[PDB]
């Protein structure tokens with residue numbers, strides 16, 4: 001059976017806050033297509049073969 | 051029938067293209083369902099309070 | 100949108116039939132627990148932070164920014180006065196310093 | 199009772215594959231997102247989830263939209279009553295109207 005992820009529980013309270021004292025810098029790669037192949041078809045030659 | 055199947059084999063590879071297109075549609079639907087909802091990394095839960 | 104975290108900048112890189120981004124992001128790392136209150140009672144006046152939150156380490160109360168732990172003494176420069184102490188739920192007592 | 203459309207299309211070779219994620223898993227994802235939003239605001243999207251009181255989170259939202267947080271901390275009961283009445287109106291509209 002597929003696992004959705006880890007089980008976590010936020011310790012919520014009336015007067016409890018969590019504040020970071022340190023950080024990290026990340027570099028993430030995002031890949032996106034832009035253009036495809038500029039094909040062309042010779043219709044008469046493809047159908048008939050001269 | 052069998053003669054219909056033989057003439058369908060003579061017509062070539064249209065059915066494979068249609069089956070491939072429908073398979074791509076189904077995989078894309080699964081990808082959309084994953085992409086919209088599966089954004090959180092961990093399964094949080096509410097406190098009893 | 101532009102990467103996972105708080106986005107800073109990106110650098111585009113070319114690719115065959117596409118483009119590739121390099122999203123630079125800021126991500127907090129090491130959190131700590133603190134005791135918090137929405138406002139401070141001082142001589143019947145309710146003091147609220149101008150930019151930041153009130154935190155406590157057990158004995159003293161400080162004003163700090165949201166995304167980093169930089170505690171500072173509660174003054175009248177970083178707090179503003181609004182109303183009295185009988186309206187806000189969860190207010191606590193502390194001495195607001197004045198320079 | 200005679201023949202139906204689903205058996206006709208099944209006998210003629212047209213099937214419907216089940217989705218990969220069941221409705222229980224979809225509800226688990228929405229419950230996880232909702233619990234993270236309620237208990238941490240927006241910090242769980244940026245990084246690790248950080249606990250915060252909900253009144254202080256709504257003060258963050260009010261400072262985001264441009265109203266000072268004393269308005270929230272003085273009108274908290276009225277804002278909570280308006281939110282509860284709005285949620286009840288939404289559930290009544292979904293119970294009555296099916297359009």
Ligand SMILES: *[C@@H]1O[C@H](CO)[C@@H](O[C@@H]2O[C@H](CO)[C@@H](O)[C@H](O)[C@H]2NC(C)=O)[C@H](O)[C@H]1NC(C)=O
Nearest residue numbers: 020021022023024025026126127128129130168
């Ligand atoms: C915040 O985190 C960074 C790294 O995540 C810490 O930097 C490290 O500090 C130790 C202690 O001297 C060094 O041995 C490492 O070489 C440092 N790493 C890097 C990449 O420079 C930093 O100390 C942390 N901040 C605090 C206040 O603890």
Ligand SMILES: *[C@@H]1O[C@H](CO)[C@@H](O)[C@H](O)[C@H]1NC(C)=O
Nearest residue numbers: 012013014015016099188189
């Ligand atoms: C939070 O406050 C409510 C009412 O003010 C109270 O019922 C509840 O026990 C409190 N919870 C904690 C953890 O203090």
Ligand SMILES: *[C@@H]1O[C@H](CO)[C@@H](O)[C@H](O)[C@H]1NC(C)=O
Nearest residue numbers: 011016018130131132133248
């Ligand atoms: C302290 O913080 C951690 C995560 O930052 C949390 O798991 C833990 O329950 C907190 N403890 C208290 C006493 O608030």
Ligand SMILES: *[C@@H]1O[C@H](CO)[C@@H](O)[C@H](O)[C@H]1NC(C)=O
Nearest residue numbers: 155156157158159160161170
């Ligand atoms: C809280 O921080 C202040 C500021 O340095 C310090 O004087 C005090 O001892 C701290 N209280 C503790 C660690 O209980």
Ligand SMILES: *[C@@H]1O[C@H](CO)[C@@H](O)[C@H](O)[C@H]1NC(C)=O
Nearest residue numbers: 140143184189190191192193
């Ligand atoms: C704060 O000081 C006032 C001054 O009389 C007192 O009545 C009150 O009990 C103190 N504590 C709180 C939590 O308001």
